[PDB]
Amino acid sequence: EFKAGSAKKGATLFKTRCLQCHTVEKGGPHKVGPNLHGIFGRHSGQAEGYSYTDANIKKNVLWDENTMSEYLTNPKKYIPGTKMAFGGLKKEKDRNDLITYLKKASE
Ligand code: HEC
């Protein structure tokens, strides 16, 4: 599903649609949502010091581009009971862009 996109456009999507709840940089603080540094390649629910729902932890998904993509289409469907209040990125090109950005910034 996932196809490489534009990191630049991904940056704008993140600013607009995610930054209110999430920081990305190494050492960034938690907010409404967890800091996302190092999210890719990790199991869900493992950002240190963050208070996750049991739903998020029990999902037991390894985050990669493709699982991220399916998650961001409809977070509540992918992880029933998650407290992440976000409807979804419905456009495939938006998911691709955001993920391209996030893969790089969260490294
Ligand atoms: C606040 C209203 C949020 C917005 C906007 C976005 N997210 Fe979020 N996210 C939020 C919370 C409170 C949580 C924790 C959910 C829980 O049930 O505990 C999350 C979780 C994520 C995760 C999973 C993290 C994990 O460690 O497994 C990811 C990957 C994530 N959020 C990404 C994400 C992106 C890319 C967003 C922009 C589209 C976004 N979130 C919006 C709160 C909020």
Curated annotation (Swiss-Prot):
GO terms for biological process: mitochondrial electron transport, cytochrome c to oxygen; mitochondrial electron transport, ubiquinol to cytochrome c. The modification N6,N6,N6-trimethyllysine is found at K76, K77. Induction: By oxygen at the level of transcription. Expression drops rapidly when the oxygen concentration falls below 0.5 uM O(2). Its cofactor is heme c. It comes from the Eukaryota. Heme c binds at C18, C21, H22, M84. GO terms for molecular function: cardiolipin binding; electron transfer activity; heme binding; metal ion binding. Binds 1 heme c group covalently per subunit. GO terms for cellular component: mitochondrial intermembrane space; mitochondrion. Gene3D superfamilies: Cytochrome c-like domain. SUPFAM superfamilies: Cytochrome c (SSF46626). Its main location: mitochondrion. Methylation may enhance its transport into mitochondria. Methylation occurs in fungi, plants, and some protozoa, but not in animals. The precise role of methylation at Lys-77 is unknown, but it seems to preclude pro-apoptotic activity, possibly by lowering affinity for APAF1. Keywords: Electron transport, Heme, Iron, Metal-binding, Methylation, Mitochondrion, Respiratory chain, Transport. It is found in: Mitochondrion intermembrane space. Electron carrier protein. The oxidized form of the cytochrome c heme group can accept an electron from the heme group of the cytochrome c1 subunit of ubiquinol-cytochrome c oxidoreductase. Cytochrome c then transfers this electron to the dinuclear copper A center (CU(A)) of the COX2 subunit of cytochrome oxidase, the final protein carrier in the mitochondrial electron-transport chain. Isoform 1 (CYC1) is the predominant cytochrome c during aerobic/normoxic growth. Present with 7330 molecules/cell in log phase SD medium. Belongs to the cytochrome c family. This is Cytochrome c isoform 1. It comes from Saccharomyces cerevisiae (strain ATCC 204508 / S288c).
